[PDB]
């Protein structure tokens, strides 16, 4: 044709189960329950962060070989 | 709320104030670190010269004169000062305010004994 853009849902994808409508209430409940655990951790982490410097938070660095990380003056 | 221009000006002023405080802290830390490094070098040289500490590459062992070490004397003096003044230290289980009050009392007692 020359105009196929329509807003109606797909006729093949608009199916329904034999036990009623599409399984959506259970799926929405599962999605909401998962979101509470998910968007409850970022809220806890973001709002309970404190930035503190006490001269002990720094630790002597070490290379991948484990030895103390020191660079010579002339490299 | 306020104008965006005023917000930008206030942000610039606050950043400048923070940078000035950082510069002051950096100067203080640089002077203190230079002094500390000089003192540590002097102490290490004195300890090695006195036959009190034997330095071996990266490990150091107590020598024959380890009893006369200035570091040992400083550790003993720090222990004595903590015992005589910071009686509740490492055992004061009070809140932040209680710990602050205890620290203030200890500092006042130390100044009185100074």
């Amino acid at each position: 044709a020359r105009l196929w853009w329509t807003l109606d849902p797909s006729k093949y994808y608009l199916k329904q189960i034999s036990s009623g409508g599409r399984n959506e209430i259970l799926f929405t409940v599962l999605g909401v329950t998962a979101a509470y655990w998910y968007f409850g951790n970022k809220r806890c982490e973001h709002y309970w962060r404190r930035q503190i410097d006490n001269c002990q938070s720094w630790s002597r660095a070490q290379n991948i070989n484990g030895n103390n990380l020191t660079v010579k003056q002339y490299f | 709320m306020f104008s965006d221009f005023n917000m930008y000006e206030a942000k610039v002023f606050l950043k400048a104030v923070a940078d000035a405080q950082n510069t002051f802290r950096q100067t203080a830390q640089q002077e203190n670190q230079l002094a500390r490094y000089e003192s540590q070098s002097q102490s290490l040289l004195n300890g090695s010269t006195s036959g009190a500490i034997s330095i071996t590459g990266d490990n150091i062992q107590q020598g024959r004169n380890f009893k006369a070490l200035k570091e040992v004397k400083l550790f003993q003096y720090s222990n004595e000062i903590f015992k005589k003044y910071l009686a509740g230290f490492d055992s004061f289980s009070g809140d932040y305010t209680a710990f602050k009050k205890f620290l203030n009392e200890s500092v006042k007692k130390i100044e009185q004994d100074a």
Binding site: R50 | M1, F2, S3, E9, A10, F13, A16, D19, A20
Partner: protein, 102 residues
């Protein structure tokens, strides 16, 4: 968990007062702030030689302390009115401008 954490905690009233004082300082001690920024712009004064810009930093800090003081009666009254308006905010541009002109 992407936004930077807060280091020093100030109350809402303290934040509003600091914002007002910073606006006043930027409108008053802008020359001192520019001097401090220029002295703290080179690599030396930035990281290597912090003692050089000490005088300019002290001048800027004294200017900021005098600005935040609001010792004048008109300045104090205007700051109190602006703080009241900002707390009502939980607009105010006229009050802020009136405080600035003091």
């Amino acid at each position: 968990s992407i936004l930077p954490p807060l280091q020093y905690t100030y109350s809402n009233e303290e934040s509003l007062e600091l914002l007002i004082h910073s606006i006043k300082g930027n409108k008053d001690c802008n020359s001192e702030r520019k001097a401090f920024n220029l002295c703290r712009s080179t690599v030396l004064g930035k990281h290597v030689e912090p003692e050089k810009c000490l005088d300019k930093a002290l001048v800027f800090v004294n200017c900021f302390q005098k600005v935040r003081r609001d010792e004048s009666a008109a300045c104090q009254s205007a700051f109190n009115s602006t703080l009241e308006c900002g707390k009502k905010y939980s607009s105010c541009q006229s009050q802020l401008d009136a405080y600035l002109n003091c």
